[PDB]
């Protein structure tokens with residue numbers, strides 16, 4: 001509700017991430033294990049029956065659900081599908097056996113999300129779980145179960161702490177289910193350690209702010225941007241492109257890194273910088289070769305990478321080294337630099353960061 | 367292998383669609399019912415067991431698989447998932463019970479697609495079915511079952527007839543399965559009638575070519591484009607944006623129509639025309655209201671719609687009326703105008719239509 005020393009609520013909300021994550025973790029971690037005994041006593045009975053997870057959401061909330069799909073399939077071994085809420089509500093879907101329905105929403109009032117929830121009641125889902133940041137909102141009220149993110153009020157029109165806290169809460173849910181399915185307890189312990197390290201990995205990332213401010217200068221006069229990512233980082237490229245669209249009004253688009261050659265490579269020139277989010281060596285090798293093909297048009301590659309990968313900048317390949325981080329929380333960590341990049345580009349251009357043109361905090365009407 | 371009267375192979379391949387579809391239909395339609403007795407005798411046993419379908423593909427082939435997902439869930443009631451081949455092959459996925467693996471590929475040699483196929487062998491899929499246009503290619507050779515599209519050789523680097531014939535073949539597969547699951551035989555009959563009408567609906571669409579040529583003039587000097595679609599037409603918006611990227615080098619991006627307000631609306635101006643693919647009245651109402659919000663920046667909406675919807679152009683809303691078509695084949699029909707739009711924009715700009723910069727017919731190497 002107040003900015004304090006910050007210039008914008010969105011800036012304040014980015015900087016509040018360490019603390020918002022600490023608050024979402026509070027009480028759910030008990031003895032190196034996840035404690036979701038707030039869902040009620042019957043909770044475990046339901047969760048244990050789940051054979052499929054369906055997530056519905058819109059905007060930035062869809063981006064978090066997409067990250068979580070990688071986590072649910074690889075860590076808890078449970079099949080997961082994520083769908084844009086507006087798409088789900090207008091089509092005839094095939095219901096999955098013992099499917100749990102999860103809705104993600106900062107506001108809990110998004111019309112298409114609520115609509116998908118309700119429709120789901122008539123379709124045979126085992127039950128519904130709402131992950132939301134606003135207590136007692138419609139989605140919270142009509143869902144069977146609810147896990148609040150507890151990030152505090154988010155005023156900026158573009159979501160920041162609500163996204164990182166949603167990813168934290170989904171990661172807790174992945175841990176709990178890996179357990180109920182009786183998977184190696186190592187899986188839950190790695191997640192819990194990663195989560196315990198999270199708040200200071202982010203304070204660690206906030207300290208590179210001046211380096212991101214400097215990079216923003218290179219993007220401030222561009223009209224296009226391409227964000228690339230593979231696996232759990234693909235959705236982070238999605239959120240990064242969305243943030244550049246939202247507050248800087250640059251036509252930034254995200255693409256799966258393996259698809260660069262199937263289309264977008266023909267577009268790359270000096271006016272369309274390419275950003276890659278945490279690639280491994282094998283992926284970097286491929287992308288370096290692709291950017292070489294567009295060197296005559298001035299294509300440049302900007303790479304956010306772990307210092308430990310030992311990558312070196314070249315003339316059209318710029319490594320932006322980042323502190324090493326635990327693999328499980330990497331997608332949450334790499335979001336921060338992309339939130340700050342969009343914020344600094346907006347500050348240079350002087351655009352309305354807290355109320356970007358034509359956008360709204362929650363679309364509560366159809 | 368030869369152009370004849372055509373200026374480019376891609377033009378020739380677009381015009382060949384009626385005939386390529388006739389050839390893919392030949393022998394698979396017997397008595398108002400689909401005849402897939404080429405898959406072998408055991409075929410029906412397998413297909414009958416399928417409880418889930420997983421599709422893998424890259425580029426334009428992913429766009430067709432995405433259309434088919436709407437069809438499989440709503441018409442045959444079977445759960446379907448479509449994934450970019452490069453993403454599937456680098457992650458740990460949760461295998462689904464009695465999942466059938468389908469790969470889509472014009473060339474049958476795409477490295478990431480082949481890789482996903484092979485990995486799938488080690489993962490517990492009930493079996494594999496390849497939909498491909500090149501007989502005896504790797505994907506064909508290593509798959510359990512195979513349905514050839516029979517569109518003939520495709521030389522243009524960007525796919526046209528291979529896409530429309532893949533959609534035809536998937537629609538035949540949806541019919542066959544609605545039957546094996548014992549669903550109303552109406553479903554198969556509607557599909558078969560739609561398919562029988564298809565070849566001349568397309569010859570019908572090819573006759574509007576001069577109207578598309580005229581529309582291309584409005585796009586020829588633009589640097590961005592936004593393509594919108596809902597449901598089975600969303601993937602058609604994906605292919606339309608991909609074609610503008612591929613041969614005209616315009617930064618065209620596709621978006622689910624319901625997500626316009628969640629981001630991209632802040633970008634719209636005179637340099638970013640918005641195209642909507644076959645909206646219904648309720649969707650048009652919403653989009654008209656959104657474009658009104660960006661009228662001061664010159665946002666324009668171009669709508670490809672059925673003449674029968676009775677929509678009327680306004681100052682910033684241009685209806686491009688199209689002949690009425692059967693609902694089931696609508697996604698295939700609406701692809702044609704978008705292929706021709708990209709082609710005419712490329713002809714005006716004088717870009718290398720058959721060999722667009724930095725692109726290749728099949729990416730056979732990693």
Ligand SMILES: O=P(O)(O)OC[C@H]1O[C@H](O)[C@H](O)[C@@H](O)[C@@H]1O
Nearest residue numbers: 059060061105106107110159628
């Ligand atoms: O997360 P929800 O409250 O459901 O809202 C979904 C989306 O709505 C609006 O578009 C906001 O500007 C976005 O930040 C948000 O992601």
Ligand SMILES: O=P(O)(O)OC[C@H]1O[C@H](O)[C@H](O)[C@@H](O)[C@@H]1O
Nearest residue numbers: 262425426427471472473476525
């Ligand atoms: O369909 P495939 O042969 O698997 O190829 C997938 C993609 O590869 C290349 O990028 C072609 O230029 C595209 O037209 C095609 O969709």
